[PDB]
Design an enzyme around this catalytic site. Structure first.
Site, PDB file in Angstrom:
ATOM      1  CD  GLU A  44      -2.734  -3.009  -7.325  1.00  0.00           C
ATOM      2  OE1 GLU A  44      -3.779  -2.031  -6.866  1.00  0.00           O
ATOM      3  OE2 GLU A  44      -2.056  -3.475  -6.577  1.00  0.00           O
ATOM      4  N   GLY A  60     -19.509  -8.981 -13.268  1.00  0.00           N
ATOM      5  CA  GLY A  60     -18.781  -8.042 -12.583  1.00  0.00           C
ATOM      6  C   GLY A  60     -18.066  -7.460 -13.833  1.00  0.00           C
ATOM      7  CG  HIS A  91      -1.148   1.435  -4.668  1.00  0.00           C
ATOM      8  ND1 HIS A  91      -1.413   1.207  -6.009  1.00  0.00           N
ATOM      9  CD2 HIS A  91      -1.554   0.198  -4.168  1.00  0.00           C
ATOM     10  CE1 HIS A  91      -1.757   0.092  -6.102  1.00  0.00           C
ATOM     11  NE2 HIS A  91      -2.022  -0.735  -5.309  1.00  0.00           N
ATOM     12  CB  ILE A 130     -15.789 -12.904 -17.178  1.00  0.00           C
ATOM     13  CG1 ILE A 130     -16.153 -13.885 -17.582  1.00  0.00           C
ATOM     14  CG2 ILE A 130     -14.381 -12.618 -16.446  1.00  0.00           C
ATOM     15  CD1 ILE A 130     -15.400 -14.666 -18.893  1.00  0.00           C
ATOM     16  CG  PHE A 131     -20.360 -14.300 -17.817  1.00  0.00           C
ATOM     17  CD1 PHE A 131     -20.141 -13.871 -19.182  1.00  0.00           C
ATOM     18  CD2 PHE A 131     -19.642 -15.404 -17.227  1.00  0.00           C
ATOM     19  CE1 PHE A 131     -19.462 -14.781 -20.183  1.00  0.00           C
ATOM     20  CE2 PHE A 131     -19.015 -16.212 -18.093  1.00  0.00           C
ATOM     21  CZ  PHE A 131     -18.971 -15.930 -19.548  1.00  0.00           C
ATOM     22  CD  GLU A 137      -2.963  -0.947  -0.178  1.00  0.00           C
ATOM     23  OE1 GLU A 137      -2.447  -2.121   0.106  1.00  0.00           O
ATOM     24  OE2 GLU A 137      -3.447  -0.744  -1.103  1.00  0.00           O
ATOM     25  CE1 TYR A 170     -10.427  -6.914 -12.642  1.00  0.00           C
ATOM     26  CE2 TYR A 170     -12.163  -7.480 -10.930  1.00  0.00           C
ATOM     27  CZ  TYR A 170     -10.716  -6.829 -11.020  1.00  0.00           C
ATOM     28  OH  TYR A 170     -10.286  -6.299 -10.052  1.00  0.00           O
TER      29      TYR A 170
END
Ligand code: CL
Ligand code: ZN
Length: 692
Positions: A508, A614, A482, A611-612, A479, A616
């Site tokens: 990331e 959400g 970032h 993937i469906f 963290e 991503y």
């Protein structure tokens, strides 16, 4: 009287000590009026110039960002139900304004005019990145479409959102339909006290008044906190098989099946891609990534190849180990056994007692080492600045990050200790201000960036300091990376500074980077000193720590590569309604990525919510992509020599001036190559995890 509201003030640091929940409702509503008015003023005066577009726009963007981020931060650290209630009421208005702001056709057209001007070729790289970002954001939302096709586009989007909810309900319903009541204590062998308490109270909730963790009536379910313990710990192979087959076939058939809803989604995604001019939906997703379809396909295959032989070894390790332990399951291991036997092998060889690891990791020592690492690598001095900025809890520290010459570069807050009354658990980095030319006060050339670091340790009491788990140290390091990219940005163009406008799959990088130092011997052994003994971490713990990191790497890698590959397959080269079916994709990719072949009935796609349902879709590769970048970025220091501290400073200085400095004002492959000397390799990742 809105005049007195802290949120509406022009402040230097946010008024965290002085905002109450009763300011939120009036102040956010007032702020949104101001910004709506200032947007309309902007749109009346738009010209394709910085002073008539981008500077006004930044001011709107930034103020909403700063204020919304302030009150939303207060909800995570200084939570009250009145504050939650206030934020959840004004949030819709906020988001409606955000939508409004990006849908601005005057602004879109003004950016388009910037892009099409001759002046384009004089514009800086960061300003070009900024303009292209605004254009691409607008375009991919349909703004550039002519009205007929914009309506088709919007209809596609609306049906897609509907289909995604129906997908999610079918999974959730198929998950909760399974209920198995055990009554025989013998069948419940191995399950932990927590799981047995869960299953007992699960039974109580369904009427079994007397149910108890010990005594029984245990109701097992397929939701995560029930499913995981069963696969990891239930000695009962029949119960493991039961729960496995059920879980891998949620929404597989029936009135609850997703198989046609998937094909519907994939079709509409293709229609969306084609209206936007792209060949397939992966092409549309990749339009905002560091990767490309071809490069993502390339990388994932490289990883899958190197990961495969390790993965077959991992199974033979289990068959070997279960033979030693005398199970008739050995020689015959399949899906429902693997999770279990892995854990058993873990417990035997690779296990680390976290109570005799905690004494070595004391928070103030850890944070000192982290800030000293940041001085070594990046050249910055973290210096206490307590009292410069107001604070929401007496324990919250405030630091100035000074450059090599003694000048402030950035500031950050640190809130270390858990307060489970009012504070979200875990650790996070958050953004207070971005670095900005435009938002500087008169006389200053730039506003300096400001960051949040938060973690959740038990506060120090008596002799005992705030001890940490190794994982907690690892997370604070992550963290802070970032935070470092946010804070050590040298980009002054504020819509593109920090982490703003860094392509998702590259975000990331600095964070996953910083975690590598927790396994670096000399860094770890400087941190890890027993709070009472003084003694360093025992060398056998260190070796086991490292062993644990690499454990089932090949099996793990292949599992992730299943998901990443099917996601790109389905959005690249599957025709919906065409020759091949969804299940032939499912099985065809499973052969390439899964050492033990799927059972029939296994329909992992019908449960693949990422993937469906959400976000991503054509993006699941991103996880492993960033992992590749960060591992490789670390191997620059490996090549330089991790024990030559001049080499580490030289390599770190160059990292400071690339990854951390440049923000989103340079494409990530350019930034990465500017650091690393070449394009990214999977070798380091594969090597660090033990697969090559
Ligand atoms: Cl993360
Ligand atoms: Zn992160």
């Amino acid at each position: 009287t809105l005049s007195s509201n802290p949120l509406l003030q022009n402040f230097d640091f946010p008024p965290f000590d002085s905002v109450d929940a009763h300011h939120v409702r009036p102040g956010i509503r007032a702020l949104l009026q101001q910004l709506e008015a200032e947007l309309e003023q902007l749109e009346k005066a738009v010209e394709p110039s910085w002073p008539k577009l981008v500077e006004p726009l930044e001011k709107i963007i930034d103020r909403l960002s700063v204020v919304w981020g302030m009150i939303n931060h207060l909800k995570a650290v200084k939570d009250t139900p009145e504050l939650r209630a206030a934020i959840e009421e004004v949030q819709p208005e906020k988001v409606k304004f955000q939508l409004r702001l990006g849908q601005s056709k005057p602004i879109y057209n003004a950016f388009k005019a910037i892009r099409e001007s001759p002046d384009w070729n004089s514009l800086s790289e960061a300003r070009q990145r900024l303009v292209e970002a605004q254009i691409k954001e607008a375009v991919l939302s349909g703004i550039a479409l002519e009205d007929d096709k914009r309506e088709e586009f919007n209809k596609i989007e609306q049906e897609l959102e509907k289909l995604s909810h129906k997908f999610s309900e079918n999974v959730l319903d198929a998950t909760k339909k399974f209920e198995k009541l055990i009554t025989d204590k013998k069948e419940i062998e191995g399950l932990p006290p927590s799981a047995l308490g869960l299953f007992a109270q699960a039974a109580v909730s369904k009427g079994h008044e007397t149910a108890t963790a010990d005594t029984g009536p245990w109701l097992i379910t397929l939701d995560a906190p029930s499913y995981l313990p069963v696969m990891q710990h239930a000695k009962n192979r029949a119960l493991r098989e039961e729960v496995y087959r059920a879980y891998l076939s949620r929404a597989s058939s029936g009135d609850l099946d997703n198989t046609a809803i998937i094909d519907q989604i994939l079709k509409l995604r293709l229609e969306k891609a084609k209206l936007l001019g792209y060949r397939n939906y992966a092409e549309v997703s990749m339009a905002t990534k560091m990767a490309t379809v071809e490069k993502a396909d390339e990388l994932l295959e490289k990883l899958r190849s190197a990961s495969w032989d390790p993965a077959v070894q991992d199974i033979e390790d289990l068959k070997s180990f279960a033979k030693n332990q005398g199970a008739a399951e050995a020689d015959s291991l399949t899906h429902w056994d693997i999770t279990f036997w892995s854990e058993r092998l873990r417990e035997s060889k690779y296990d680390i007692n976290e109570e005799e690891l905690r004494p070595y990791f004391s928070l103030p020592k850890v944070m000192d080492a982290l800030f000293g690492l940041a001085k070594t690598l990046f050249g910055i001095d973290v210096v206490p600045a307590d009292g410069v900025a107001p604070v929401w809890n007496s324990d919250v520290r405030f630091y100035c990050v000074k450059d090599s010459s003694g000048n402030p570069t950035a500031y950050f807050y640190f809130d270390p200790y858990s307060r489970p009354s009012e504070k979200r658990d875990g650790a996070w980095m958050d953004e207070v201000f971005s670095r900005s030319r435009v938002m500087a006060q008169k006389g200053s050339s730039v506003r300096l960036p400001v960051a949040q670091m938060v973690c959740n340790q038990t506060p120090p009491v008596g002799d005992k300091p705030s001890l940490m788990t190794f994982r907690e140290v690892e997370t604070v390091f992550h963290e802070f990376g970032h935070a470092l990219q946010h804070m050590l940005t040298k980009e002054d163009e504020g819509l593109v500074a920090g982490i703003r406008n860094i392509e998702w799959d590259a975000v990331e990088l600095p964070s996953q980077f910083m975690e590598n130092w927790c396994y670096h011997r000399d860094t770890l052994m400087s941190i890890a000193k027993h709070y009472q003994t003084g003694e360093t971490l025992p060398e056998n713990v260190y070796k086991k720590l490292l062993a644990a990191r690499t454990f089932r790497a090949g099996s793990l890698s292949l599992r992730q590569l299943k998901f990443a590959t099917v996601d790109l397959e389905l959005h690249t080269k599957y025709m919906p309604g065409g020759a091949e079916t969804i299940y032939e994709v499912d099985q065809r990719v499973s052969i390439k990525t899964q050492v033990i072949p799927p059972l029939p009935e296994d329909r992992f796609l019908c449960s693949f919510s990422h993937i469906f349902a959400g976000g991503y879709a054509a993006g699941y590769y991103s996880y492993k992509w960033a992992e590749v970048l960060s591992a490789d970025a670390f191997s620059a220091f490996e090549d330089a020599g991790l024990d030559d501290i001049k080499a580490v400073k030289e390599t770190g200085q160059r990292f400071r001036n690339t990854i951390l400095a440049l923000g989103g004002g340079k494409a990530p492959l350019k930034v990465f190559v500017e650091f690393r000397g070449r394009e990214p390799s999977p070798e380091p990742l594969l090597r660090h995890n033990g697969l090559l």
